[PDB]
Structure formats: structure tokens, C-alpha cells
Amino acid sequence: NDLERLFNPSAIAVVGASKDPSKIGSQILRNLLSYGFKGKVYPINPTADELMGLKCYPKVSDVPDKVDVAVISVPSDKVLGVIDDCGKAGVKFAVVITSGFKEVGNEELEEELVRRAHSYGMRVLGPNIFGYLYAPARLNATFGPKDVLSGNVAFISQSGALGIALMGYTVVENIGISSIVSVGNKADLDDVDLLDFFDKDPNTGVIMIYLEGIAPGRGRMFIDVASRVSLRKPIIVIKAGRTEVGARAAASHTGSIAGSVAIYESAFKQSGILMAKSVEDAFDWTKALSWNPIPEGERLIVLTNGGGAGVQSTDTFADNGIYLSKPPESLIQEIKKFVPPFASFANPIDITGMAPDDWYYMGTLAALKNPDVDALTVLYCQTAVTTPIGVAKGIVDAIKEAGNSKPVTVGMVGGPEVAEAVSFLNKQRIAAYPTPERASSAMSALYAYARARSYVMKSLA
Amino acid sequence: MNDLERLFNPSAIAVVGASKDPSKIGSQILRNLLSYGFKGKVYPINPTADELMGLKCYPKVSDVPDKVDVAVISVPSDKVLGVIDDCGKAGVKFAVVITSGFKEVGNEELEEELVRRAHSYGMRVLGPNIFGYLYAPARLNATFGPKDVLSGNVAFISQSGALGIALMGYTVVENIGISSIVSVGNKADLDDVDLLDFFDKDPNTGVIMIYLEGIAPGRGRMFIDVASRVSLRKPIIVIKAGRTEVGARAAASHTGSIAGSVAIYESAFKQSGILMAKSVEDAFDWTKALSWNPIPEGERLIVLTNGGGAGVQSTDTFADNGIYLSKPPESLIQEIKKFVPPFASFANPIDITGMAPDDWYYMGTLAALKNPDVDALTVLYCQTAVTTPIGVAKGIVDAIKEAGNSKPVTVGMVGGPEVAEAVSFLNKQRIAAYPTPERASSAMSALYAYARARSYVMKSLAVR
Amino acid sequence: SSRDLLLKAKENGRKSLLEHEAKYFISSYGIPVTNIRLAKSEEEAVNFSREIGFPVVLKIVSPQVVHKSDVGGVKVNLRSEEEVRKAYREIIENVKRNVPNAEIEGILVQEFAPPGVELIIGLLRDPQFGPTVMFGLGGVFVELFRDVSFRVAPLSEQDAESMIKEVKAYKLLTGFRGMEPVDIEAIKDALIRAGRIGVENEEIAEMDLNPVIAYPKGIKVVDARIILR
Amino acid sequence: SSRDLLLKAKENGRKSLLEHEAKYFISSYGIPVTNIRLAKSEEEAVNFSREIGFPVVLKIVSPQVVHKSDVGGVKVNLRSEEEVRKAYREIIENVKRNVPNAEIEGILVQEFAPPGVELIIGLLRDPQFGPTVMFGLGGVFVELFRDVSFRVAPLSEQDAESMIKEVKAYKLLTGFRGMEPVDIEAIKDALIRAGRIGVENEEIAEMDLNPVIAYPKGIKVVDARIILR
Numbered sequence A: 001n002d003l004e005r006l007f008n009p010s011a012i013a014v015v016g017a018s019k020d021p022s023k024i025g026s027q028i029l030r031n032l033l034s035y036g037f038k039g040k041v042y043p044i045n046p047t048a049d050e051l052m053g054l055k056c057y058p059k060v061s062d063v064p065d066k067v068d069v070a071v072i073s074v075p076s077d078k079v080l081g082v083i084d085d086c087g088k089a090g091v092k093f094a095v096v097i098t099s100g101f102k103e104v105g106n107e108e109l110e111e112e113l114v115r116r117a118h119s120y121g122m123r124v125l126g127p128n129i130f131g132y133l134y135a136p137a138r139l140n141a142t143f144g145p146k147d148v149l150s151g152n153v154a155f156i157s158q159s160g161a162l163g164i165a166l167m168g169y170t171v172v173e174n175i176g177i178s179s180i181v182s183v184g185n186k187a188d189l190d191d192v193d194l195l196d197f198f199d200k201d202p203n204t205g206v207i208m209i210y211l212e213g214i215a216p217g218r219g220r221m222f223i224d225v226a227s228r229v230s231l232r233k234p235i236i237v238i239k240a241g242r243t244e245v246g247a248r249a250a251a252s253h254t255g256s257i258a259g260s261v262a263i264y265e266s267a268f269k270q271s272g273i274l275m276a277k278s279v280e281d282a283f284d285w286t287k288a289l290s291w292n293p294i295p296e297g298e299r300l301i302v303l304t305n306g307g308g309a310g311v312q313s314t315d316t317f318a319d320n321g322i323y324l325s326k327p328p329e330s331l332i333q334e335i336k337k338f339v340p341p342f343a344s345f346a347n348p349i350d351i352t353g354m355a356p357d358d359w360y361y362m363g364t365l366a367a368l369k370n371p372d373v374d375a376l377t378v379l380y381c382q383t384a385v386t387t388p389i390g391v392a393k394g395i396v397d398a399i400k401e402a403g404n405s406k407p408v409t410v411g412m413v414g415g416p417e418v419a420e421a422v423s424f425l426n427k428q429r430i431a432a433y434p435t436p437e438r439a440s441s442a443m444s445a446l447y448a449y450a451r452a453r454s455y456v457m458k459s460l461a
Numbered sequence B: 001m002n003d004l005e006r007l008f009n010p011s012a013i014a015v016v017g018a019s020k021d022p023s024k025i026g027s028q029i030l031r032n033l034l035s036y037g038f039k040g041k042v043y044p045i046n047p048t049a050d051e052l053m054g055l056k057c058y059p060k061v062s063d064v065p066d067k068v069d070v071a072v073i074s075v076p077s078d079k080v081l082g083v084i085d086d087c088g089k090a091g092v093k094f095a096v097v098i099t100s101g102f103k104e105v106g107n108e109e110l111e112e113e114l115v116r117r118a119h120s121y122g123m124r125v126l127g128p129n130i131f132g133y134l135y136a137p138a139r140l141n142a143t144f145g146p147k148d149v150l151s152g153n154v155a156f157i158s159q160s161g162a163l164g165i166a167l168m169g170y171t172v173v174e175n176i177g178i179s180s181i182v183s184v185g186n187k188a189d190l191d192d193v194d195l196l197d198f199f200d201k202d203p204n205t206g207v208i209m210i211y212l213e214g215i216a217p218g219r220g221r222m223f224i225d226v227a228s229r230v231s232l233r234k235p236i237i238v239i240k241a242g243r244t245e246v247g248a249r250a251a252a253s254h255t256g257s258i259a260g261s262v263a264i265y266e267s268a269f270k271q272s273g274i275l276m277a278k279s280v281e282d283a284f285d286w287t288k289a290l291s292w293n294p295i296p297e298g299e300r301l302i303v304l305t306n307g308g309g310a311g312v313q314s315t316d317t318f319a320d321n322g323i324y325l326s327k328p329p330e331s332l333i334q335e336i337k338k339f340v341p342p343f344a345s346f347a348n349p350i351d352i353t354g355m356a357p358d359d360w361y362y363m364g365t366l367a368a369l370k371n372p373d374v375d376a377l378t379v380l381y382c383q384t385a386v387t388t389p390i391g392v393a394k395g396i397v398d399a400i401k402e403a404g405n406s407k408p409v410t411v412g413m414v415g416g417p418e419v420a421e422a423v424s425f426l427n428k429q430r431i432a433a434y435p436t437p438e439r440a441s442s443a444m445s446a447l448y449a450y451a452r453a454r455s456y457v458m459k460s461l462a463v464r
Numbered sequence C, D: 001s002s003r004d005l006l007l008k009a010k011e012n013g014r015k016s017l018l019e020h021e022a023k024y025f026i027s028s029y030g031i032p033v034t035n036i037r038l039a040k041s042e043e044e045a046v047n048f049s050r051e052i053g054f055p056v057v058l059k060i061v062s063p064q065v066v067h068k069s070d071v072g073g074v075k076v077n078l079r080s081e082e083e084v085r086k087a088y089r090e091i092i093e094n095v096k097r098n099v100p101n102a103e104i105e106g107i108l109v110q111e112f113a114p115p116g117v118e119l120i121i122g123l124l125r126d127p128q129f130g131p132t133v134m135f136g137l138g139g140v141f142v143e144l145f146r147d148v149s150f151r152v153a154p155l156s157e158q159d160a161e162s163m164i165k166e167v168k169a170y171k172l173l174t175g176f177r178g179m180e181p182v183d184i185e186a187i188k189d190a191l192i193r194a195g196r197i198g199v200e201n202e203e204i205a206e207m208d209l210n211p212v213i214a215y216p217k218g219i220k221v222v223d224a225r226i227i228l229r
């Protein structure tokens, strides 16, 4: 299959839009227009002369154009009819918003839907989804938020309400998005198909998936495709049902059999996939992976103005199987030119609690420029002798002047001024977090992906 | 003596080392003391100043025509012992020694002399190498940290200087109401045990959080004896520094000590009923929940959610904490079925469906809290276009009020800027709210973890 | 074709291959097994033992006996003719008594493998992922503690090596009190081949190699079960 | 309880109690140990063996021999007079050869404890928390996997019970293939008493009970080392 005309359609129909603007079909039509889609848009309604200033048709087959994608927002008892008309009209993708299929026990209706669509060479996304978004095509075919930040992250969600909520949350966490895809019941198109597309897609550099489960017989292909993707792009999976009780629970929300926890975990490892146990971890890691190259070696330096934060960092890294070694002697000499003699250079490098703003610039610069340093996590505890924003600007300037590209994460602990500084850094695509452990877990994800890519390279010869 | 009443509630405080130069630490401490609204007497001590910050200054504490309870000492280490001697003559009961340059840099001898001289006058030492202390009930900010904190019932003790003073600021951002901040630094005299004894008796303090690198040789047995009994009434959360072998080895060099046993510290905390936090964020998330909620009276925990996804994340997270959900009582199910569609799941979590309107959050929360076979509630909310986050938040507030009881509640909200606002709104009303379902569930898990920790200690104390 | 064994079993309404057939089958995939001489008489048992060399092991072979030790159907370290004869009769009587209605196909004679580190190698079929290889240390480590690793087949060398290092009891393979490190490469090779068996032979539902004895040099599959569908 | 052994050891500049003294010492605290006899001659060994009852175990007793098995100083399951004599001479020769400069205080004769579930019970003095009791399953489980639990003494019943249930190999105590559940109450009782030994005897730096054999009814300490400071 080829999803080029799903993500970059020349013509999209919205079936189920209405004069009533509160209805979901209408919300989707609104989003499609406001987000700036440039192709042709065809509202489909049984009586409306026009909707949102656009000529409306009673059937897709009446549209004097070739429709690539039909977004279907009619009740389940009306879906099969629309599928037949769309099939007649030659539409390539049916994006079926509609709920009331396998997830509520109507397995047969769902299977009939897919077989009817396939009979016309038409593929199905969903059903029971909130739609999809593709930023490079200015395509917001969801009834979720109207806008997202632009960037290189594709987010696939098997969950409806959580997915659409997380779509909104990407904005709060400053995550730039290339795509949002609701896959819901996964009756046809699934994670494997989407990973195949995002693998090639130059607009997408990171893929995050909220995954409850995949279909029987589909796991081997999942590993084959995922592992190949992982050679070039990190995949983060939020696994729903990581525990026996969770797996049972999630199973009934979609009306499936509970999958083997242990075998899914093995499949992820074989695929080079990073499994996140929470939203927070998934987003923290995604941010870091989106904005940093992978470390080229293990010479990770931690820079801190307080031993406490440094210890918190050391412990967190160790929990992730990352152990620090002594810094290069050349870096120690460089930093000793402005640091007091009671500073620790064991790694973390403690520039002492009394460091002024300027030492963060000089320390960050010296580390990044050093040829025997592969990565840097910078930690900052607010005191009265510094300004959080001054420290933040010092880190920005050091990263520019170093002129290279090495992974960096930043932890800042303090009051409202620190919250502002962290935000400032993140709005410049420098991965910043309000605690040392989260900055360190974020750097750990860079090393985990480096190791995962290595796993897959070795596995594939 | 071991009574700290007049440390935290002094009638008279001296600041030794304040200066006409306002950039100096002594001056910063004096400024905070005045800014934060101390009602007792403040005596700047400086060698020449006629007055500092509009207050009569004296050349030595012994010249002050008053009984000074506490002397905050901010002079270089080579000037400290002299000041201690004068403080002794003046009868000061507590020396709060800001000054660095003692054991942490290898001068064990100077530090031991400090304590000996202080004890010789019946004077106790806090520190040295600290950023001071704050006690909200006494409007007492004797630190050079932020000028203000939110008032509340949490006492925070920190062995770390920079992280401690930074976390002091972070309490404001995380809406954590504070009764006390205590920097303990080198712990040459007064330590965690002394402070736990005070906060035990303190009606203003309901939760104690400690950033702990280590305790002194020979002090652990007493630590367990005091902490375990405190834990019967007030939760203690410890952020343990060096909780891994490599962290403990490294941290050993932070002050130049022997690495403490990771495994034995963990057992000591368990025997003490203490909750060990592995991160700042967990410590703060738990502290918030424990600060603002009673302990659950039983195991009947209900999770309320729109859409299954957040609910599954919650279930997995609770399971990781050894908390398992049971089917809700039939009485609750019938009550909620009065407004929820038949396609809703009542397995627990209770799924009121993803497109539930604001109103159902009010009604579901109220029904749950009012039900006699519900002990605790976690409410999860995914923002969609059919709701408003603030409307949902207010529905929860109103439900908690109308239920009129006191059952633990935590809230998780996922969404855009409006959700960030709603979560802030909830936290400012002392309703424990978090931006993900896992953090809301971990926070509720801390309430149960504290109940279990307390049960461990009680079983341990059971009369034969 | 080794597949004749599978086809014959299906034709006869059997749901498993018995030890000698299972060992023959996996042997044809290059997994090392024991000698497998099927004795019909006490006399044949003696002759086979002399050919194989002492010490030997005798085992019941019967469709109705899955757990052979539990019914007294296994005798090890038999070092002489007379001891073989004793064991032969001892097994027959145990089986007659514990499983009256058992179809006795015969008595399997095999070398007695010297002590080493016991492993388990398994094959199962997952609904999502298909044939999946399982690994773990023998005895309590899998059976009681459930300390196992999985890799979905086919396995790469990287898959095989990593799934071994993954199990909590891994250090039993790398040298401990009174025991040399074992041959990790031979284990990896067996794991890859187990995966290939699972990929290629669709009528195999499960395989259980329990135990596989690992030595400083090489391994030896000492018992084998193949379940058909 | 018989502090005199500790006082005598200090008075004589020893930094440890030897197996028989250690066993006597903990026995006076109510921890079950093996019956023991210190034989100075091969003849006393024989006579003591009859007194104890067969089968017996013989072990070297020497300050310069802490690890007795490693130097061939332990012989188990000696079932007759002749086997005792044989073992006696074998141990003496093994120790003279492997540890030439070893002060042979004699040969300890003790009952032969039958196989059960092996445990380790330890005592150490932590700089912060003082006497601390350690528990784990025997052999590889503590020595290789480091699966241990700790409780600071004195132990409550709650401490003892939970620290047993806490270790990863706990299920070896609650019934598995070919082994009944062992007496957890006897284990708890031993752990508490170990804590009392540490609390009450400040000159004890370490105690190592490795192994303690656990049975469906009761336990039995089979080796014991106490290190003084």
C-alpha cells in the first residue's frame, strides 16, 4: 500500500457535516478550513446547499472530482451505505470517525465494513477515531484542537479521549508535531502501515505511539518494519496494559484478547523501540530525541552548581544503566581557570553553589568544545547570586558558539523565574526540565536510543 | 537542652555579619527577616554600623540589652569561634551558623571545636554550612533564600545547600504550603532526629519532607525510634541521596565520608514508616497529596475517567504500587447509570465515556464521595471540545464541598493551556491536581503507602 | 523427510512426538541430542547399553506417560548389565502400577550425560507474534520463579545472545562456586534453531526442551517434547 | 548467655570464635545447633562419633582455617567407625598440606544434618544503625545473586516475618517440586535471637550462620562463625 494520498490528499470529503455547528462532522470541517488546507474540500450532507461557504453534495459519488479521502461522521447504521458510495466514487481512504463497532461488541459490522471497503480497493482508518492531522499538508482532519506546534514528531494513538487530550498537551510541553493519527479500532490500516509511511517521510524524525495492542498475525511484520525504522528514527511506545491487570482492563476497552506483556516487551526490544511507562516519560524523551543527535560515545558530563542535584542525577542515570566516568583532564584544566579549588571534578563537575551566571556559559562551552566529551547534562539550582534567565541565555550562547551538535539536556530547580527560564529554553528547542532527575531521564533516553539502534544494527547484520 | 521551641519561636534574633553593603549574605538574611514580618526583636550585629535596615546595631551580641534566643552567624570561618564565645557570654541558646569552610572542606577540627565551645555555654548549633531556616507560624525567614513561601503545614529539612534553597523556591511553583524550611548542612550538632522531635509536637506541621544524604555514626537507632513514633501521626517523606551503589560511592566524596549501606538505610526507613522518594517530583507530588488529604479509611478506591486510555494508565500505575482496583459498589453503579449511557464501563475505573459533558464530572464525583462503600477517589479528565477544563474543575470542587465529608481525592487532567490553568486552579484550592493520570495515581498511591507504612510500625509495636 | 514423523503422528491421531521422535526431529535441525535406541526387550536394552557405553539411562516410552519421573519411568547412571536389567524391570513395574492402561512402545536407552548447568529452551505460539522462543535456567528458576526470556522468531544472533544475558539467573552461566562458565555460543545456536523449527513447521504448537545440559564446551538436549496442533 | 566465651577470646587476643565456641554461644541464645565434640585424637573422634550417633560429620578446627571446605577440612556422611578414621586422617593431611602453618586445635565431630532447604542468617554492625540482621536463601542465592534482606535490631515479629517474605527466593520456603514448606516460625525465632545476640554483645562485629538447614519442623545451624572487634 501507499499512504501518500492519505497524508497529502488533493481532495477531501467530510460526510456528516451539518448546518448544526455543534456536530462532530461540522467540527472537523471547521478544523480543516481554519488550519489552512489548500486542496478541495467537499461537505457531504443530505440537504445542505452549502456548508462553511462551500458547495455541499448529497453523496461523494456526486462530487465532480476525484476524492482521495472521505472522513465519515455518520451513525454506524449509515456507514456501510456511505462506504458503498465512496467505493463507487473511487475514494482511496475512508477515515471512519464513527463508533459502535467492535469496541461495543459488533465485531461483525466492523468486519463487513472493511470487506466492503476492500472490495473497492479502498482502505479504512479506524473506525472509532477522532481523525488525523498532517502539518506539512496543513491538514487538520480531527475534531480536536485547531492547531499544533510545527515540528518533526508523529503521534499515533489507539486511544480516543487520551489521544485527543495529548494532542492538546503537546502544545503545553512545546513538542513540535508533524502528524497526529487516531487509529482506534485498527480494523484495517494499523501501526505497521503508518510506520512504513513515517519511515520514508522526511518531515517526521520521531514517532510516538500510544499502543493497547496489535492484531493477531501482525506482530512479526511490526517487528520487521519497526526495527528498520529504528535504524534512522526513534520510536517511543506508551504501552497500555504493562501489567497483568492493566492488560486485562485495556483488553475490554477495545474488545480484544489480552496480549502477553512479556512478549510485547521482547518485541519492542527486538524492534529498537523505547517503552515508556508514563505520559510524562514519553513526552520528556520525545522532546530530547526530537531536538538532539544521538551521543557518539559514552563520555557524558554532568555540570552542576550543587552536589545535591548532581547526586540526584547520578542515581537517576544509574537506574537507567548509565554510569559516569572521570572527565577529561583537559576539561578539568579549562574549568579550573575560573572555578574555586574546593570544586569537585569527579563527574558530575560541581562548580559550587556560589557560581555566577557566567560560569554556566564558560563551563557549558568548555565541555561541548572538548573532543573527549560526547554529551552534556547541565543542572542549575537557583540561588540569589544567579538569575535563571541569565543562566539559560548562557547555555544558549554556549551551544551556539560550540558550533557543534552534541546532545544536551538541562535541569533547573527553583521558583517562578526558573519556570520562565525552562520555558524559554524549551521554546528554543533546548530540552529543559524542572528537576534534575527528569533532565537525566531525558538524557538517558538519548543513550537508550543509541543502544537500541545498535541492537537493531547488530540484529540486521 | 533538646527543646527547640525558642529556636522556631524566638523573642529576639541577632544577625551577626550584616553590613551596610547589601550584597552580603548577612544583609540578605536581615532583609528577609524584616520583609517576611518577624514580630519579635531583631538585632543587627556589625563592628561599626550605627544602624542597619533602620534598626539599632550593636558591635557584639553581649551588648544587646535583651536576652537573645538565636544568633544567625554570617561571618568568615576564622571569625566564627570568637562570635560563639560572645554569644555564650550573652546566653544565646542557638547558633545558626551560615558559614562554610568546616568539615565539608576537610576542617573537621574547626567544626568539632565549634560544637564543643557552643555546648560549653549550653548553646546548640544548627549547621554549619547552611542557608538558614524559616518558620511560617512565627513569620520568621532567617535565610538568604526567597523572601516568601506559601503558608501551610509542610516542614522541609535539607542536608543539601543549593538544592535545598532551590527547592524552597520550587514549593511556590508547586503550590506547596510550608510551615518550615530548615537547612541542616553539616549536621555537626542539631540533626534530623532533634528536628523530628520538634515537628512531632508542632500543631502547625502535618507533613515532614527530608532531603537526606546520611546520618551520623551511632545515630541511626535513635533515628528509627523517633521517626517510627512520629510516623504514627505524621507522614515523613525522605529524598534519599545516594540511593544507588554508585550514587552512594560518589556522594561519599561529596563531604568525604564512608559510603552508607544502601540496603540498610532502606530497611531503617521501612522500620520507621518513612516513604522514600526517588525523585524531587515524586516527593513533591506525594507531599501535596498527604498535606491536603486524610488517610483513606479502607481499600475501596474508585477511579473516575472519561475514556479508557487514561484509566488504563491509572490501573497500570496503581498496580506498580501494589494497589489493585475492585468493582465499584452496585449502589454507586446504579446512581451513575442515572445519567451515563449503557456503553459505559463500570469495572473500575468507571468510564463515563470520552464525550461526557462538564456536568457528569460534578455528578459522578458527588455520587462517589457520598457513597458509604467508597474510601477514596481519583478523578481523571481528558480535555475534548465538548467540555471546559475549568468547568470540570469547578464541578469537582463543588462535589467535594457538597459531599461535605473528607475522603482523599486526587485529580489528573490532560490537555492544552486551559488544562494547565484548571490544574493550577485546583492546586490553589488545595485539591491535589496533576497534568497526567499516572502522577495523579502515584499521588493517591502515596496516601495508601503511608497507611501501609503506619501499619508496619503499629504491627512492630504490637503489645504481646 | 523429518516431516514424515509429524505426518505419521497426525495420521495416528497423536497430539505429540515422543522423546525419541522429538530428539530425532530437532537433531535434524542441528540441535545436539542423546543417543536414542528403542529397546523392545530387556535383552535389547542390555545390547544397546553395551554399544552406547556406560553409564546409561533408561526411560519409559508411552503416549500415556508425559511426566516420566513422576511415575518412576526414568533410571539414570546405570553402570552395568545387571543394573540395566534391574532398572528395565523396575520401570516396567512402576508404569504398570501407576498407569495401568499405558501403551508401552518400549524402553529408550541413552548415554548418561555428565552433570553441568541445566537450561530450558522452549517454543510457543503467540497470537500477535507467532512462533516465540523461550529461554531460562533449569529447575526452580523457570518452574518456580518463572525467570524466562522471550524472542519472537526468527532469531538473529543478537536476539539469541541478548535473551540469554537478560534472565535474572544469567550469572549461573558465567562461572560460580564449583562451576566453570558454559558455552554461550552453543546455547545461542540452539535458540536460533529452535526458532527456525517454529517458523517452518506450522503443525508444531509447542516445544519443550527440559533439560538441556550446558558444558564449558557444547550442550546436550537430554529430554524433548513436541506438541502438535 | 555464656558471655564467658567472648571474654576468654578477648583475654587471649583472638578475634573470632571457632565453630564449636560459636555454636555453643548461639545455642545458649536458643538457636538450634548441631551436637558437637572436639576430638584431640583419632580415638576420641571414633568414641565421640558413637556418642553422637551415625552418620557424622568431621571438620578441622583451626584459627588459620576460616574456609574449611576449600582446603579439604570437611567430611560429611561418615557412617561407620572405619569411615570416621579414614576421614580423620584425610582432613589432617589436607590441612597440613594446604595450610602448613595451621594450629590444629583438633577435629570437630557433629551430627549429620539431612538435606533440607539451606539458609543464611547474618549479623553485622552498621556504622549508622548498629547491629543489623541479614537473611537469605543459601548457596548461590546470597553468594552469587546477593538476594538478601536486612532489619536493624532488635527485631520485632513483624520485622522477622516481613524480611523473610521480602527476599526474591522466598518461594523456596513455601513448597516446591520435591520439597515441603519449611518451618518459617523457627526461622523468625532464629532471626530475632540473632538480633538479640548483636544488641547484647557489643564486642561482636559479625556473625555468619552459613548454612542453616530448614525443615518442615524446625531448623538447624550447621556452620557458625563469630568475629569479634
Ligand SMILES: CC(C)(COP(=O)(O)OP(=O)(O)OC[C@H]1O[C@@H](n2cnc3c(N)ncnc32)[C@H](O)[C@@H]1OP(=O)(O)O)[C@@H](O)C(=O)NCCC(=O)NCCS
Pocket (backbone or CB within 6 Å): A015, A016, A017, A018, A019, A020, A023, A024, A025, A044, A045, A046, A047, A058, A059, A072, A073, A074, A075, A076, A078, A081, A082, A097, A098, A099, A100, A128, A129, A130, A160, A161, A164, B354, B355
Ligand atoms: C459519528 C457520530 C459523531 C455521528 O453522530 P451525529 O452527528 O449526532 O449523527 P447524525 O444523525 O446527526 O449525522 C450527522 C449528519 O450526517 C447526515 N447524514 C446521515 N446519513 C448521511 C449520508 N448517507 N450521507 C451524508 N450525510 C448523512 C445526517 O442527516 C446529519 O446531518 P443533519 O444535521 O443535516 O441531519 C456518532 O455516531 C459517533 O459515533 N460518535 C462517537 C464518537 C466518539 O465518541 N469517539 C471517541 C473518540 S474521542
Ligand SMILES: CC(C)(COP(=O)(O)OP(=O)(O)OC[C@H]1O[C@@H](n2cnc3c(N)ncnc32)[C@H](O)[C@@H]1OP(=O)(O)O)[C@@H](O)C(=O)NCCC(=O)NCCS
Pocket (backbone or CB within 6 Å): A353, B016, B017, B018, B019, B020, B021, B024, B025, B026, B045, B046, B047, B048, B059, B060, B073, B074, B075, B076, B077, B079, B082, B083, B098, B099, B100, B101, B129, B130, B131, B161, B162, B165
Ligand atoms: C559567612 C560568609 C557568607 C561571610 O562572607 P562575607 O560576608 O563576604 O564576609 P565578611 O568578612 O564581609 O563579614 C561580613 C561582615 O561581618 C563583619 N564581622 C566580622 N567579624 C565580626 C564579628 N566578630 N562581629 C560582628 N561582625 C563581624 C565584617 O566586618 C563584615 O561587615 P562589614 O561589611 O561592615 O565589614 C562566608 O564566609 C561563607 O561562609 N559563605 C558561604 C556560605 C554558604 O555557602 N553556605 C551554605 C548554604 S548554600
Ligand SMILES: Nc1ncnc2c1ncn2[C@@H]1O[C@H](COP(=O)(O)CP(=O)(O)O)[C@@H](O)[C@H]1O
Pocket (backbone or CB within 6 Å): C034, C057, C059, C066, C067, C068, C069, C070, C074, C076, C110, C111, C112, C113, C114, C210, C211, C222, C223
Ligand atoms: N541422558 C541423560 N543424561 C543425564 N541425565 C539425564 C538424562 N536423561 C534424563 N536425565 C535426568 O533425569 C531427569 C528426568 O528425565 P526426563 O526429563 O526425560 C523425565 P520427565 O521430565 O518426563 O519426568 C532429567 O531432568 C535429568 O535430570
Ligand SMILES: Nc1ncnc2c1ncn2[C@@H]1O[C@H](COP(=O)(O)CP(=O)(O)O)[C@@H](O)[C@H]1O
Pocket (backbone or CB within 6 Å): D034, D057, D059, D066, D067, D068, D069, D070, D074, D076, D110, D111, D112, D113, D114, D210, D211, D222, D223, D224
Ligand atoms: N553437620 C552437617 N550436616 C550436614 N552437612 C553439613 C554439616 N556441616 C557441614 N555440612 C555441609 O558441608 C558444607 C561445608 O561445611 P561448612 O559450612 O561447615 C565449612 P566452610 O563454610 O568453612 O567451607 C556445608 O555448607 C554443608 O553443605
Ligand SMILES: [Ca+2]
Pocket (backbone or CB within 6 Å): C210, C211, C223
Ligand atoms: Ca523433562
Ligand SMILES: [Ca+2]
Pocket (backbone or CB within 6 Å): D210, D211, D223
Ligand atoms: Ca559455611
Ligand SMILES: [Cl-]
Pocket (backbone or CB within 6 Å): A045, A046, A047, A048, A049, A056, A057, A058
Ligand atoms: Cl444536498
Ligand SMILES: [Cl-]
Pocket (backbone or CB within 6 Å): A015, A044, A058, A059, A060, A061, A082, A085, A086
Ligand atoms: Cl457519501
Ligand SMILES: [Cl-]
Pocket (backbone or CB within 6 Å): A309, A379, A380, A381, A411, A412, A413, A434, A435, A436
Ligand atoms: Cl537541577
Ligand SMILES: [Cl-]
Pocket (backbone or CB within 6 Å): B046, B047, B048, B049, B050, B057, B058, B059, B060
Ligand atoms: Cl558597633
Ligand SMILES: [Cl-]
Pocket (backbone or CB within 6 Å): B016, B045, B059, B060, B061, B062, B083, B086, B087
Ligand atoms: Cl557577637
Ligand SMILES: [Cl-]
Pocket (backbone or CB within 6 Å): B310, B379, B380, B381, B382, B412, B413, B414, B436, B437
Ligand atoms: Cl487524566
Ligand SMILES: [Hg+2]
Pocket (backbone or CB within 6 Å): A044, A045, A046, A047, A048, A049, A050, A056, A057, A058
Ligand atoms: Hg448537500
Ligand SMILES: [Hg+2]
Pocket (backbone or CB within 6 Å): A015, A059, A060, A061, A070, A081, A082, A083, A085, A086, A087
Ligand atoms: Hg461516501
Ligand SMILES: [Hg+2]
Pocket (backbone or CB within 6 Å): A153, A155, A170, A175, A208, A283, A286
Ligand atoms: Hg508526543
Ligand SMILES: [Hg+2]
Pocket (backbone or CB within 6 Å): A306, A309, A379, A380, A381, A382, A411, A412, A413, A436, B163, B166
Ligand atoms: Hg538543580
